[PDB]
Amino acid sequence: AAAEWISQQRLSLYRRSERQELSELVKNRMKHLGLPTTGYDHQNTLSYVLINPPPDTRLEPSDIVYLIRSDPLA
Amino acid sequence: IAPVLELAVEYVKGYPPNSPYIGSSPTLCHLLPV
Amino acid sequence: RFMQFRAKDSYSLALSKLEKRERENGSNLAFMFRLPFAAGRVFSISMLDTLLYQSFVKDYMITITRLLLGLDTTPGS
Numbered sequence: 001a002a003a004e005w006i007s008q009q010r011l012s013l014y015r016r017s018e019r020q021e022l023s024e025l026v027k028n029r030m031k032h033l034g035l036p037t038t039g040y041d042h043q044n045t046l047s048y049v050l051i052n053p054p055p056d057t058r059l060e061p062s063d064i065v066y067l068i069r070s071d072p073l074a
Numbered sequence: 075i076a077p078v079l080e081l082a083v084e085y086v087k088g089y090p091p092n093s094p095y096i097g098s099s100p101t102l103c104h105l106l107p108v
Numbered sequence: 109r110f111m112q113f114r115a116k117d118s119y120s121l122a123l124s125k126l127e128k129r130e131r132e133n134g135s136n137l138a139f140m141f142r143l144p145f146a147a148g149r150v151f152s153i154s155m156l157d158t159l160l161y162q163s164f165v166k167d168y169m170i171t172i173t174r175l176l177l178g179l180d181t182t183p184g185s
Contacts, residue, residue: 006102010102025093
């Protein structure tokens with residue numbers, strides 16, 4: 001009855017995506033090198049730089065404001 | 075000839091573990107047990 | 109033609125004339141009657157170029173070849 005199990009994996013490997021292929025390649029190399037697979041567990045964002053925006057622009061969350069901090073020793 | 079009908083060490087069989095590259099189609103192969 | 113070359117061989121030397129006639133009639137398969145190729149002793153990767161050019165007209169051609177070669181494995185094929 002092993003052929004039934006073989007067919008199960010065969011459909012699974014055929015249905016598997018490229019992300020799973022890339023994910024398994026990293027994990028295969030990690031166990032070969034001895035590193036735990038967990039912790040390897042995508043970038044759905046768009047970022048840009050605003051040079052000197054007007055004083056009326058709204059502050060959104062996760063915003064990073066470039067600062068020129070004065071010399072602490074002076 | 076019968077007519078065509080209108081109506082119908084030993085090796086393990088598995089997939090090679092370490093795929094060398096991405097896109098290598100997994101073929102069930104004759105594999106060494108170890 | 110230089111795969112298994114018998115210089116003192118009238119038959120293989122006569123195949124040269126046949127391939128020149130086929131090359132005369134504009135045949136793209138002129139190497140076809142060389143004995144090593146017809147026997148499967150030689151092939152060229154330039155056939156893969158023709159496979160890619162053919163796919164402009166036959167979008168199934170690359171898939172069919174890999175199915176025959178086993179390069180792609182579809183369940184039930």
